[PDB]
Design a protein around this motif. Structure first.
Motif, PDB file in Angstrom:
ATOM      1  N   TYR A  53       1.290  -1.182  -0.379  1.00  0.00           N
ATOM      2  CA  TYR A  53      -0.224   0.039  -0.070  1.00  0.00           C
ATOM      3  C   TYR A  53       1.017   1.456   0.364  1.00  0.00           C
ATOM      4  CZ  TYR A  53      -4.674  -2.133   0.311  1.00  0.00           C
ATOM      5  OH  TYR A  53      -5.849  -2.694   0.351  1.00  0.00           O
ATOM      6  N   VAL A  54       1.756   0.704   0.788  1.00  0.00           N
ATOM      7  CA  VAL A  54       3.244   2.494   1.066  1.00  0.00           C
ATOM      8  C   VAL A  54       3.754   2.506  -0.739  1.00  0.00           C
ATOM      9  CG1 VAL A  54       4.943   3.095   1.473  1.00  0.00           C
ATOM     10  CG2 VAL A  54       3.435   1.935   3.217  1.00  0.00           C
ATOM     11  N   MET A  55       3.793   1.367  -1.055  1.00  0.00           N
ATOM     12  CA  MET A  55       4.190   1.851  -2.438  1.00  0.00           C
ATOM     13  C   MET A  55       3.514   1.650  -3.835  1.00  0.00           C
ATOM     14  SD  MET A  55       6.828   0.545  -1.163  1.00  0.00           S
ATOM     15  CE  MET A  55       8.582   0.409  -2.057  1.00  0.00           C
ATOM     16  N   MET A  56       1.988   1.918  -3.513  1.00  0.00           N
ATOM     17  CA  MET A  56       0.977   2.227  -4.180  1.00  0.00           C
ATOM     18  C   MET A  56       0.506   3.859  -4.430  1.00  0.00           C
ATOM     19  SD  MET A  56      -0.161  -1.384  -4.602  1.00  0.00           S
ATOM     20  CE  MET A  56      -1.131  -1.267  -3.829  1.00  0.00           C
ATOM     21  N   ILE A  57       1.000   4.440  -3.303  1.00  0.00           N
ATOM     22  CA  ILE A  57       0.975   5.478  -2.955  1.00  0.00           C
ATOM     23  C   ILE A  57       2.405   6.085  -3.698  1.00  0.00           C
ATOM     24  CG2 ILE A  57       0.656   7.585  -0.634  1.00  0.00           C
ATOM     25  CD1 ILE A  57      -1.308   5.805  -0.657  1.00  0.00           C
ATOM     26  N   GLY A  58       3.507   5.500  -3.168  1.00  0.00           N
ATOM     27  CA  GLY A  58       4.270   6.071  -4.132  1.00  0.00           C
ATOM     28  C   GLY A  58       4.271   6.497  -4.922  1.00  0.00           C
ATOM     29  N   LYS A  59       3.865   5.017  -5.352  1.00  0.00           N
ATOM     30  CA  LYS A  59       3.824   4.948  -7.405  1.00  0.00           C
ATOM     31  C   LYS A  59       2.825   6.182  -8.102  1.00  0.00           C
ATOM     32  CE  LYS A  59       7.068   2.457  -8.178  1.00  0.00           C
ATOM     33  NZ  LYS A  59       7.767   2.454  -6.781  1.00  0.00           N
ATOM     34  N   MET A  60       1.750   6.471  -6.817  1.00  0.00           N
ATOM     35  CA  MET A  60       0.184   7.115  -7.482  1.00  0.00           C
ATOM     36  C   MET A  60       0.661   8.392  -7.144  1.00  0.00           C
ATOM     37  SD  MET A  60      -2.012   4.691  -9.038  1.00  0.00           S
ATOM     38  CE  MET A  60      -2.332   3.075  -8.465  1.00  0.00           C
TER      39      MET A  60
END
Ligand SMILES: CC(C)CCC[C@@H](C)[C@H]1CC[C@H]2[C@@H]3CC=C4C[C@@H](OC(=O)CCC(=O)O)CC[C@]4(C)[C@H]3CC[C@]12C
Ligand SMILES: CC(C)CCC[C@@H](C)[C@H]1CC[C@H]2[C@@H]3CC=C4C[C@@H](OC(=O)CCC(=O)O)CC[C@]4(C)[C@H]3CC[C@]12C
Ligand SMILES: CC(C)CCC[C@@H](C)[C@H]1CC[C@H]2[C@@H]3CC=C4C[C@@H](OC(=O)CCC(=O)O)CC[C@]4(C)[C@H]3CC[C@]12C
Ligand SMILES: CC(C)CCC[C@@H](C)[C@H]1CC[C@H]2[C@@H]3CC=C4C[C@@H](OC(=O)CCC(=O)O)CC[C@]4(C)[C@H]3CC[C@]12C
Ligand SMILES: CC(C)CCC[C@@H](C)[C@H]1CC[C@H]2[C@@H]3CC=C4C[C@@H](OC(=O)CCC(=O)O)CC[C@]4(C)[C@H]3CC[C@]12C
Ligand SMILES: CC(C)CCC[C@@H](C)[C@H]1CC[C@H]2[C@@H]3CC=C4C[C@@H](OC(=O)CCC(=O)O)CC[C@]4(C)[C@H]3CC[C@]12C
Lengths: 660, 134, 71, 49
Positions: free
Chosen positions: A426-433
């Motif tokens: 979920y942290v990596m999703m934010i990072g990408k979005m």
């Protein structure tokens, strides 16, 4: 050449075999090289320092990127650059490889060897440096050939992967053709796939020797181990295979082997500190060893550091909300000691970096984003402190700065909660979005500030130059994205009340257009973009989790025993014991015998990998179709000659039987 | 029990865990804005548990509609001369309103979409399992 | 259940597993990649036997020429 | 060896279902027993077969 030139008693002269070896190398003739090594020209006898120097100094073969690289190293360190020295290209591996690989070339030791000529000039592992030569100069079938013939093949695979990826990023930095960036990228993916394949082959053969393979020190490859080379490579799949994850599980648990709902058992282990007597460990003194083992696992340092962080955030919340008298409270002293010792922790970490130069140390530390944002955090909190210990009005501004820090430490708890393995993604999703939200912010900026200048310029007709106009531009449109449409302010009753100004009837329609294109179009574009970006990021997901885990593992082995709020105690012992007894991790130091055991294990595993590839190729349907097609052709011709020749047999046999 | 609503019940039961992770990240952002708000605007109050309510009341209902437009940048010093640095409160609120109502929610749309790809292929047959129980 | 109906059930069960294993063997033999493999192996044998027929062909040709020499 | 024994004898259906439950039991219980992940994967594979 293999059938007639290489004849029985073709009288081979002296030196011309090695000269033809050199000439075969510099024209990229891989199977001629196989032919002449098959004759038995010791390749260790071949590599002289002079022959290697002129082996790099040849303008034949394919395109050589090493020109622009040695010019960049010559620029950044301080003609046709004749006699490109081995020292300069060693610096090229220093630049491309980065981190802490200090080459044998660039090591001062071998320069004092080189001052003699500024086994005698012959390397003890020639295939190593040869591979490095082949990889830097685009020659890839050469690199496969020298990967098969040699020792320490896994290390070779990883250094070739990193070197090739680094040349890919370098070639993309100079904005060359995407052909060259593509071929460097593809070549590095090929080496990485060989590394994964050799790893899983070693895993299937023998497991303990696979761990010993992935943990020993590489004296030739600048005193490091395979996991360090792999994390330097950012070759995600190699730190995703179960071998490395099992090793990092063993490292994460440390010297304790309890492992039954581990997080709950360790939070009951540290709280009520006499609870670790019931926890099993790997096989007065047997209690002091238990408490020392249970205070030096990475996992206990993690949890007890996280308790320090959450205790910090609770205490700083209690500071920022409650009144501030002129001398700071006891809780505030705990807060400012945490920040001060955290700064000392960052300073200890910047001194204890494997690059020797302090500029290299601060550079490789500024590569990591959270650490530099921690530096601006500690700097602003100390500025807030020095404003806070003064008088009015700087006390209030100190409260402002304390609030500004409160947001950032909340952002750092998102990082300390960036583990879990179910929340890490979920942290990596934010990072990408966030990057896609930036494009959203640009388009929403132009449409929003269009409506802002419209609604100010229509409604308010005679205003003087003041900065409050920009606040009206950016204030009223913005919240209409998020709900409230400012119902009272829209179409005010007029002319029945002050008179209507100019064409104030147009701004309802402009508002209609704005809320349409804002709440119906752009936000829902960010729906669509976030949907497919989630579709790529779910494909990796837990994979990149394993990769970032490694970094966390190493830091929680290398961090001291104490939490930051009192870590100054352990810093005291770091300046006392290490300056009295001395001033007055995964790396397995291994013996030569076990080293040779790991070596011939490598040779058996790589030969098993090669026979598996050839057996897959032979048993693949494509090869079967081709070989049956060719063999039916051969049979067709043989049937032609059978029918003709044995029809002539029938004619002759009948004629002979007629005669007799 | 019915072969059409029963799968939807199962879908909800699957989506709650993703919702919980959404809730945790929503607490970290919302409490960041709450610690900011109840301090920069309110710089002179004694220890009281009422502050705890205030650190959760005002940011949470901003997610679900009303942004409390009357209580944001109140007219200063024209009326009490307002707080320490209270002009920054709309800017940090704008950051909170955006991140919260756009990024995390839209990511949760994407999360729900992919999990509904996964559990629809399950759904009809798992009703065909659960039928036996009743 | 009674014992004779159980015996009928057990006969059904051994029958059905027998037809299943027969059907999967016939699936495996009629699948494409096995036909490819068996054809490749057969043509391997075909070519080696045919080259032997070539050597033995030239041997017969020489024999018949020698027989026609003596007649 | 188990599939060979499944070939022979009688009551093959009951055998297959019990073996599936036992295989999934070793799979999840070995997941909590924290050996190598290779077995829990292959145990799941055995229950699927
Ligand atoms: C084009 C996009 C990307 C941004 C929109 C820009 C405008 C909203 C800005 C640009 C120029 C600005 C003006 C530049 C100069 C001044 C003078 C300024 O006067 C003072 O501060 C006091 C007197 C002085 O010292 O000049 C008041 C704001 C004002 C009118 C500014 C109002 C806002 C303006 C129109
Ligand atoms: C790329 C994104 C982040 C664009 C955001 C930048 C601007 C839209 C912001 C940044 C700083 C803001 C300014 C910060 C402070 C002021 C002073 C403020 O005026 C006063 O404080 C005194 C005058 C008065 O309001 O009576 C009027 C709004 C204004 C110009 C703001 C207008 C909008 C600005 C230029
Ligand atoms: C189908 C979608 C794309 C748009 C649907 C909404 C519009 C058809 C409506 C919404 C608000 C309406 C506006 C609301 C108020 C006015 C002001 C009105 O002017 C007055 O009342 C004069 C001033 C006065 O009476 O004092 C003229 C119509 C207009 C522009 C309306 C035109 C039609 C609008 C744009
Ligand atoms: C970091 C996050 C995840 C946890 C929540 C942080 C804050 C919202 C909490 C942590 C400690 C709490 C404080 C702990 C103790 C008190 C004393 C309490 O005082 C009384 O009950 C009587 C008055 C007195 O004598 O102080 C009032 C609430 C307060 C300030 C609490 C307010 C809310 C605080 C700051
Ligand atoms: C992070 C989420 C998932 C956990 C939810 C727990 C807290 C956010 C809630 C649960 C109960 C709440 C408390 C319930 C009752 C009160 C008493 C209330 O007190 C008063 O109104 C006057 C008395 C005083 O101020 O001491 C102040 C809010 C407070 C502390 C609440 C603050 C917020 C609390 C701790
Ligand atoms: C789409 C992206 C670029 C965000 C767009 C929104 C911001 C650019 C706007 C929204 C609300 C605005 C703020 C609304 C209120 C104020 C208070 C204002 O303060 C005063 O006028 C001083 C009053 C006093 O002296 O008490 C300064 C500008 C500021 C921070 C504004 C700055 C610009 C903000 C953050």
């Amino acid at each position: 050449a293999r059938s007639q030139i290489f004849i029985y008693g073709q009288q081979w002269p002296v030196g011309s075999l090695e000269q033809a070896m050199l000439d075969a190398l510099v024209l990229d003739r891989v199977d001629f090289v196989k032919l002449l090594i098959e004759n038995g020209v010791s390749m260790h006898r071949f590599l002289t320092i002079s022959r290697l120097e002129e082996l790099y100094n040849t303008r034949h073969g394919p395109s050589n990127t090493l020109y622009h690289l040695v010019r960049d190293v010559k620029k950044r360190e301080y003609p046709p650059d004749y006699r490109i020295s081995l020292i300069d290209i060693g610096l090229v591996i220093e630049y491309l490889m980065g981190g802490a690989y200090r080459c044998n070339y660039t090591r001062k030791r071998f320069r004092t060897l080189y001052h003699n000529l500024f086994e005698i000039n012959h390397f003890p592992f020639p295939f190593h440096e040869l591979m490095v030569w082949a990889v830097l100069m685009k020659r890839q079938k050469m690199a496969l050939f020298f990967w098969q013939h040699g020792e320490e093949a896994m290390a070779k695979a990883l250094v070739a992967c990193k070197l090739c990826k680094a040349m890919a990023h370098e070639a993309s930095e100079n904005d060359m053709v995407d052909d060259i960036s593509q071929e460097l990228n593809h070549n590095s993916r090929d080496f990485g796939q060989l590394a994964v394949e050799l790893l899983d082959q070693s895993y299937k053969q023998d497991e303990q020797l696979a761990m010993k393979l992935l943990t020993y020190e590489l004296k030739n490859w600048s005193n490091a181990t395979c996991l360090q080379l792999a994390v330097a490579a950012k070759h995600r799949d190699f730190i995703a295979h179960t071998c490395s994850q099992m090793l990092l599980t063993d490292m994460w648990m440390g010297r304790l082997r309890m492992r039954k709902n581990s997080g709950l058992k360790v939070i009951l282990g540290i709280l009520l500190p006499p609870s670790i007597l019931s926890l099993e460990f790997k096989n007065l003194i047997p209690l002091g060893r238990k408490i020392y083992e249970f205070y030096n696992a990475p996992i206990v340092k993690f949890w007890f550091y996280t308790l320090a962080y959450i205790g910090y955030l609770m205490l700083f919340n209690y500071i920022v909300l409650v009144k501030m008298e002129r001398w700071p409270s006891t809780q505030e002293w705990i807060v400012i000691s945490y920040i001060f010792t955290l700064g000392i922790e960052k300073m200890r970490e910047i001194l204890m970096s494997e690059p020797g130069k302090l500029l290299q140390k601060v550079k490789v530390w500024l590569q990591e984003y959270w650490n530099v944002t921690d530096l601006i955090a500690i700097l602003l909190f100390s500025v807030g402190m020095i404003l806070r210990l003064q008088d009015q009005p700087f006390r209030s501004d100190g409260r402002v700065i304390y609030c500004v820090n409160i947001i950032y430490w909340y952002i750092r708890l998102l990082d300390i909660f960036g583990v879990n393995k179910y929340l890490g993604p979920y942290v990596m999703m934010i990072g990408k979005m966030m990057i896609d939200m930036m494009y959203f912010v640009i388009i929403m900026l132009v449409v929003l500030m269009s409506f802002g200048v419209a609604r100010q310029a229509i409604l308010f007709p005679n205003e003087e130059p003041s900065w409050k106009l920009a606040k009206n531009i950016f204030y009223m449109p913005y919240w209409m994205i998020y709900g409230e449409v400012f119902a009272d302010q829209i179409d005010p009753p007029c002319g029945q009340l002050p008179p209507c100004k100019t064409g104030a009837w147009i701004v309802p329609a402009i508002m209609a257009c704005y809320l349409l294109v804002a709440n119906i179009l752009l936000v829902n574009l960010l729906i669509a973009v976030f949907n497919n970006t989630f579709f790529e990021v779910k494909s990796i997901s837990n994979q990149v989790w394993k990769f970032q885990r490694y970094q966390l593992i190493m830091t929680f082995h290398e961090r001291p025993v104490l939490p930051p709020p009192l870590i100054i105690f352990s810093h005291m012992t770091m300046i006392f014991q290490h300056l009295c007894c001395r001033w007055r991790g995964l790396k397995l130091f291994i013996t030569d015998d076990e080293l040779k055991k790991v070596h011939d294990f490598e040779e058996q595993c790589i030969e098993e990998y090669f026979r598996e590839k050839d057996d897959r190729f032979n048993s693949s349907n494509d090869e079967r179709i081709r070989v049956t097609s060719e063999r039916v052709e051969n049979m067709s011709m043989r049937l032609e000659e059978v029918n003709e020749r044995e029809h002539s047999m029938k004619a002759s046999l009948q004629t002979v039987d007629i005669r007799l």
